[PDB]
Design an enzyme around this catalytic site. Structure first.
Site, PDB file in Angstrom:
ATOM      1  N   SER C 143       1.091  -1.082  -0.147  1.00 39.39           N
ATOM      2  CA  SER C 143      -0.196   0.010  -0.081  1.00 39.39           C
ATOM      3  C   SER C 143       0.897   1.183   0.167  1.00 39.39           C
ATOM      4  O   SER C 143       2.183   1.142   0.542  1.00 39.39           O
ATOM      5  CB  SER C 143      -0.985  -0.054   1.391  1.00 39.39           C
ATOM      6  OG  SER C 143      -1.444   1.368   1.534  1.00 39.39           O
ATOM      7  N   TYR C 156      -1.695  -1.447  10.815  1.00 43.36           N
ATOM      8  CA  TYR C 156      -1.624  -1.702   9.323  1.00 43.36           C
ATOM      9  C   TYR C 156      -0.433  -0.964   8.452  1.00 43.36           C
ATOM     10  O   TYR C 156      -0.013  -1.540   7.586  1.00 43.36           O
ATOM     11  CB  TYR C 156      -2.955  -1.080   8.733  1.00 43.36           C
ATOM     12  CG  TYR C 156      -3.202  -1.207   7.314  1.00 43.36           C
ATOM     13  CD1 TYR C 156      -3.651  -2.292   6.692  1.00 43.36           C
ATOM     14  CD2 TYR C 156      -3.168   0.054   6.663  1.00 43.36           C
ATOM     15  CE1 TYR C 156      -3.805  -2.156   4.991  1.00 43.36           C
ATOM     16  CE2 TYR C 156      -3.362  -0.062   5.052  1.00 43.36           C
ATOM     17  CZ  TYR C 156      -3.705  -1.075   4.588  1.00 43.36           C
ATOM     18  OH  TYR C 156      -3.885  -1.119   3.143  1.00 43.36           O
ATOM     19  N   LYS C 160       2.362  -3.093   6.080  1.00 42.86           N
ATOM     20  CA  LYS C 160       2.528  -2.491   4.779  1.00 42.86           C
ATOM     21  C   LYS C 160       4.045  -2.393   4.572  1.00 42.86           C
ATOM     22  O   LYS C 160       4.514  -2.736   3.428  1.00 42.86           O
ATOM     23  CB  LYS C 160       1.653  -1.641   4.508  1.00 42.86           C
ATOM     24  CG  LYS C 160       0.095  -2.116   4.141  1.00 42.86           C
ATOM     25  CD  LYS C 160      -0.089  -3.310   3.476  1.00 42.86           C
ATOM     26  CE  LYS C 160      -1.537  -3.634   3.149  1.00 42.86           C
ATOM     27  NZ  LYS C 160      -1.319  -4.841   2.410  1.00 42.86           N
TER      28      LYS C 160
HETATM   29  N1  LIG Z   1      -7.867   1.815  -1.124  1.00 42.70           N
HETATM   30  C1  LIG Z   1      -7.674   0.373  -0.959  1.00 42.70           C
HETATM   31  O1  LIG Z   1      -8.698  -0.213  -1.182  1.00 42.70           O
HETATM   32  C2  LIG Z   1      -6.253  -0.140  -0.790  1.00 42.70           C
HETATM   33  C3  LIG Z   1      -5.383   0.776  -0.651  1.00 42.70           C
HETATM   34  C4  LIG Z   1      -3.922   0.378  -0.329  1.00 42.70           C
HETATM   35  C5  LIG Z   1      -3.674  -1.120  -0.499  1.00 42.70           C
HETATM   36  N2  LIG Z   1      -5.028  -2.070  -0.694  1.00 42.70           N
HETATM   37  C6  LIG Z   1      -4.774  -3.399  -0.296  1.00 42.70           C
HETATM   38  O2  LIG Z   1      -5.577  -4.197  -1.264  1.00 42.70           O
HETATM   39  C7  LIG Z   1      -5.826  -5.488  -0.513  1.00 42.70           C
HETATM   40  C8  LIG Z   1      -7.282  -5.196  -0.230  1.00 42.70           C
HETATM   41  O3  LIG Z   1      -8.104  -5.175  -1.292  1.00 42.70           O
HETATM   42  P1  LIG Z   1      -9.507  -4.397  -1.503  1.00 42.70           P
HETATM   43  O4  LIG Z   1      -9.378  -2.793  -1.078  1.00 42.70           O
HETATM   44  O5  LIG Z   1      -9.516  -5.078  -3.037  1.00 42.70           O
HETATM   45  O6  LIG Z   1     -10.487  -5.029  -0.530  1.00 42.70           O
HETATM   46  P2  LIG Z   1     -12.213  -5.576  -0.906  1.00 42.70           P
HETATM   47  O7  LIG Z   1     -12.523  -5.109  -2.125  1.00 42.70           O
HETATM   48  O8  LIG Z   1     -12.891  -5.620   0.530  1.00 42.70           O
HETATM   49  O9  LIG Z   1     -11.525  -7.194  -1.274  1.00 42.70           O
HETATM   50  C9  LIG Z   1     -11.048  -7.925  -0.070  1.00 42.70           C
HETATM   51  C10 LIG Z   1     -10.918  -9.314  -0.489  1.00 42.70           C
HETATM   52  O10 LIG Z   1      -9.894 -10.082   0.422  1.00 42.70           O
HETATM   53  C11 LIG Z   1     -10.758 -11.320   0.941  1.00 42.70           C
HETATM   54  N3  LIG Z   1     -10.295 -11.563   2.205  1.00 42.70           N
HETATM   55  C12 LIG Z   1     -10.147 -10.887   3.459  1.00 42.70           C
HETATM   56  N4  LIG Z   1      -9.596 -11.562   4.436  1.00 42.70           N
HETATM   57  C13 LIG Z   1      -9.119 -12.738   3.700  1.00 42.70           C
HETATM   58  C14 LIG Z   1      -8.249 -13.695   4.318  1.00 42.70           C
HETATM   59  N5  LIG Z   1      -7.980 -13.963   5.726  1.00 42.70           N
HETATM   60  N6  LIG Z   1      -7.959 -14.815   3.266  1.00 42.70           N
HETATM   61  C15 LIG Z   1      -8.322 -14.800   2.073  1.00 42.70           C
HETATM   62  N7  LIG Z   1      -9.227 -13.674   1.614  1.00 42.70           N
HETATM   63  C16 LIG Z   1      -9.396 -12.647   2.528  1.00 42.70           C
HETATM   64  C17 LIG Z   1     -12.211 -11.109   0.753  1.00 42.70           C
HETATM   65  O11 LIG Z   1     -13.038 -12.248   0.845  1.00 42.70           O
HETATM   66  P3  LIG Z   1     -13.555 -12.922   1.905  1.00 42.70           P
HETATM   67  O12 LIG Z   1     -14.417 -12.007   2.538  1.00 42.70           O
HETATM   68  O13 LIG Z   1     -14.347 -14.039   1.239  1.00 42.70           O
HETATM   69  O14 LIG Z   1     -12.335 -13.745   2.499  1.00 42.70           O
HETATM   70  C18 LIG Z   1     -12.252 -10.261  -0.352  1.00 42.70           C
HETATM   71  O15 LIG Z   1     -12.201 -10.970  -1.627  1.00 42.70           O
HETATM   72  C19 LIG Z   1      -5.179  -5.279   0.744  1.00 42.70           C
HETATM   73  O16 LIG Z   1      -4.008  -6.277   0.705  1.00 42.70           O
HETATM   74  C20 LIG Z   1      -5.001  -3.697   1.008  1.00 42.70           C
HETATM   75  O17 LIG Z   1      -4.134  -3.650   2.048  1.00 42.70           O
HETATM   76  C21 LIG Z   1      -6.095  -1.465  -0.757  1.00 42.70           C
END
Ligand SMILES: NC(=O)c1ccc[n+]([C@@H]2O[C@H](COP(=O)([O-])OP(=O)(O)OC[C@H]3O[C@@H](n4cnc5c(N)ncnc54)[C@H](OP(=O)(O)O)[C@@H]3O)[C@@H](O)[C@H]2O)c1
Ligand SMILES: NC(=O)c1ccc[n+]([C@@H]2O[C@H](COP(=O)([O-])OP(=O)(O)OC[C@H]3O[C@@H](n4cnc5c(N)ncnc54)[C@H](OP(=O)(O)O)[C@@H]3O)[C@@H](O)[C@H]2O)c1
Ligand SMILES: NC(=O)c1ccc[n+]([C@@H]2O[C@H](COP(=O)([O-])OP(=O)(O)OC[C@H]3O[C@@H](n4cnc5c(N)ncnc54)[C@H](OP(=O)(O)O)[C@@H]3O)[C@@H](O)[C@H]2O)c1
Ligand SMILES: NC(=O)c1ccc[n+]([C@@H]2O[C@H](COP(=O)([O-])OP(=O)(O)OC[C@H]3O[C@@H](n4cnc5c(N)ncnc54)[C@H](OP(=O)(O)O)[C@@H]3O)[C@@H](O)[C@H]2O)c1
Lengths: 254, 253, 252, 251
Positions: C143, C156, C160
């Site tokens: 991130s 968090y 990261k």
């Molecule tokens: N602004 C942002 O959105 C942002 C910014 C920087 C980085 N990120 C990074 O992007 C990733 C988050 O993605 P997103 O924003 O796309 O989230 P999102 O749309 O809420 O999707 C999260 C996904 O993670 C799965 N999940 C959660 N815990 C899990 C676990 N323990 N094992 C396997 N699957 C799991 C969920 O499915 P289930 O609920 O079925 O497990 C879901 O498919 C993270 O690594 C985050 O730190 C996001």
């Protein structure tokens, strides 16, 4: 009459019964601070305290394994009782990393490395914050490593943990700024200590490492002491969120 | 408790006001013999007057760092008067005007790169032989937080301050065999004439404070301690390092 | 061509948002993808949606925090497709806004476990398979918080930043096996994960000004760089973190 | 065809990295105007790419000359109607020399060609990109920006400066919908770098020193540039991407 720069301050330094921590402890005390040293082994604490009290420095000690919440909280209590407050924390402990492929690193190594190297300083900082608030502020220095920027293979868990500490430093600096607590980081290069002995055991290996690290000499513990004492002083009041590499020119980052 | 720069000889460029002046004062308080210098003889005069009236071993001479003749003469002046040189602090910068890249003239690019980038490299070249004869020395280059976090409107300046990160690194590697250390100070927003535009209106000051995520603007003296420390043998294992003095404002890991 | 033709990819946490967008793209670029997350129903719906686009995508449950789920993910892919070429590790714990002073030891443990340890062990579990294929590609999702933390999310944030270190140390360790390891560092992307920062329209505008961006990201804004990094067109890129943040400050 | 109907200028694109970039962009659908200092290099470059069925033409442009820069832009506009992409790839050839031996003339030429020229070349394309609703600029720096070797101080400084130029332009130009990113290659096998690889003994020495398994090729740099130029990279600006086969750079 030139004044002591840490006149009337109280400092905790973890893992300060040998090497870098010890060198830091001695300098803070030399610079006018009351200092409490600690480490895991009571026989290490007594010798460090004897040596430094031998020099007329305001130093006392106690056992504190940074991985133990009881020890961390007891360290803070001891200091507050004896000196009436805490102004400075230097967090210096790390787990001795075994050389090995990431394929041979067990889950237990990961857990212990992340606990002691990353969680412990966060929780140790948490424990001193209320005492620092009472004093009107304070200064925290976390000890990471050049390895945070320039990892060598074989030390993956350790490497990750030292990089993590760059973030811990940045994030705590922002969070604690409204309490007037500054938070900085020391990132040493290769310093000659028991911790790094594997890398300077042989005169051949010392020469090999110098060539690899593009350095003219290995560091000594006391090469790290001045910057930490400066950072802990009010002369550095406009420095927070900063990592200072002390690596004799070895590559780090811009 | 010793003077950490006892018997040491220091050149500080652009040292008649602000950060450079404060560095000069602190080097001399820590035992150094200091030659201060800037473009205008009137500023040099009162700089020296002020510091000598505090009992500090300080003298001055005019030096525009963009002029080869001035650089060489500054070195000559120090060698003649003190017998050698241990420390160089390079602090000069061209005052940047707010403006779009679309209105930055070729002459502005040339002057900025000359004064802000080439001149510190040539100034350092001028001191190396004298540092060699003392067994080594310490160089500190003044860049800026802008090197890491540029603001729009000052692109030539921004580029030149980032370049200085590179100059610090490349020179630290080049000059290490001569036992010469090279480090860099990167200040955040410091209250000086240079930066007045960003703090002249109190509404602009509080605006900058919120933009930069700081609780206060820096003062010149906030930069002096680290530079005096880096110029000392207590920092013998620090070279190739940029230290940010920005009161918490974002910079880099 | 189809740059990932006949390649087999695991993407963890790939039933919504960024991980799903990555799975879709890898699949569109020719790859066989096994999508996975904690909830079977989420898995089912993701698979149904991608298979309806004619893509070669199957699913299975995998909570990246469970050793047995990680081992089974690899086994599932090896049985169905014969091997593994690509791992994208995308799971993170949902972070709650709060002071370091209120963060419990249990929150530290879980965050470090799921966000840092799990990626490392998930990579360990795919390494032997990638060797048998002549090498492979690992992408770790960190991130912008790794470089530019905001207060209130310290655990968090720290995790990261640790991932930058993991990417770099693994890149070096696995280079002799012809395994590349790179990292995606997203800025503020509009997903449920970050909904606290954009659900209120005035909050969204406030974050744009604070982050110095013209818009928030979308999951698809992350998918192209990841699929590129997994292709042989990126064969001389390893140990690299790419920020996808719309110009929000990060690092030189 | 991610770059379909886009117009790309690539400076210093008649050999090595610039040439590989010009080829890929054209393969990805862009109309490309290649250029460098010598007409015969341009003609050979153009003939080869035209023989591959690509929409490529050429013209002479020495990036250090104001008139060449402006005429390069005019040539592209006249032929294609507008400009969408600029890749700035030109650098002065560095020769090993102690800082004590680097002349002031070398400092001037290096800062001029490596730092000022990219900035002024970008300035030259900005009004045209505005007319198209935005555009994409890629600046070629180097791993030397992060990890300088001794003996190349002027060049090293100039490549670090380009990190700043990428960042300051990305911020300034964002409101015009112009993205600005940077390619930082490691050791690539071209004539530019021949002192570091021509001798096999030297090649093996540098590989060990840089902690790499192979030297780069020019085509190793092409994909990331083409990607960055495409709308698929619309959320990427202000970013330097290192293409160094694992050699150290930065976090
Ligand atoms: N602004 C942002 O959105 C942002 C910014 C920087 C980085 N990120 C990074 O992007 C990733 C988050 O993605 P997103 O924003 O796309 O989230 P999102 O749309 O809420 O999707 C999260 C996904 O993670 C799965 N999940 C959660 N815990 C899990 C676990 N323990 N094992 C396997 N699957 C799991 C969920 O499915 P289930 O609920 O079925 O497990 C879901 O498919 C993270 O690594 C985050 O730190 C996001
Ligand atoms: N090349 C280097 O030496 C180098 C380079 C970069 C960073 N560092 C960092 O510097 C620190 C190590 O210091 P050093 O090199 O000075 O090592 P050292 O001279 O061997 O000293 C190690 C100290 O840590 C104490 N200690 C070990 N585990 C502890 C624990 N769990 N709780 C409290 N104290 C503990 C030891 O005392 P007890 O045995 O009594 O507990 C001893 O005082 C680490 O953070 C390391 O990552 C070292
Ligand atoms: N103030 C800030 O917020 C800030 C922030 C980041 C970085 N900096 C850096 O700090 C340095 C000094 O800034 P300051 O804020 O202390 O400015 P200041 O208070 O206005 O002082 C500027 C000094 O530079 C001298 N000078 C200007 N051009 C010169 C030249 N070509 N040769 C020799 N001397 C010259 C001036 O004297 P004459 O007019 O007599 O020559 C004066 O003594 C600059 O490198 C600047 O980039 C400042
Ligand atoms: N290891 C590496 O090779 C390496 C590593 C990092 C960065 N780079 C960067 O890669 C870029 C290109 O180098 P390369 O290695 O691909 O070199 P190359 O194969 O020798 O090709 C250089 C090209 O630049 C042209 N050129 C030279 N000066 C020019 C000028 N003033 N204006 C316009 N064109 C000019 C040459 O054509 P004419 O002779 O016809 O002008 C030729 O087309 C440079 O920016 C360099 O800093 C290279």
């Amino acid at each position: 009459t030139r004044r002591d720069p840490l006149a009337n301050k109280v400092a905790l330094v973890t893992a300060s019964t040998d090497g870098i921590g010890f060198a830091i402890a001695r300098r803070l005390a030399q610079d006018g601070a009351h200092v409490v040293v600690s480490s895991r082994k009571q026989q290490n604490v007594d010798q460090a305290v004897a040596t430094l009290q031998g020099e007329g420095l305001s130093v006392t000690g106690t056992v504190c394994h940074v991985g133990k919440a009881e020890d961390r909280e007891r360290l803070v209590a001891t200091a507050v009782k004896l000196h009436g407050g805490i102004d400075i924390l230097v967090s210096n402990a790390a787990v001795n990393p075994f050389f090995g492929s990431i394929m041979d690193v067990t889950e237990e190594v990961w857990d212990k490395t992340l606990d002691i190297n990353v969680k412990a300083p966060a929780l140790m900082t948490k424990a001193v914050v209320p005492e620092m608030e009472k004093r009107g502020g304070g200064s925290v220095v976390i000890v990471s490593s050049i390895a945070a920027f320039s990892p060598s293979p074989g030390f993956s868990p350790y490497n990750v943990s030292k990089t993590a500490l760059l973030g811990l430093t940045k994030t705590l600096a922002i969070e604690l700024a409204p309490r007037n607590i500054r938070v900085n980081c020391l990132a040493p290069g290769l310093i000659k200590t028991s911790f790094s002995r594997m890398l300077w055991m042989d005169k051949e290996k010392e020469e090999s490492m110098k060539e690899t690290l593009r350095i003219r000499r290995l560091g000594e513990p006391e090469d790290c002491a001045g910057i930490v004492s400066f950072l802990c002083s009010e002369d550095a009041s406009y420095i927070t969120g900063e990592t200072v590499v002390v690596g004799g020119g070895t590559p780090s980052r811009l």
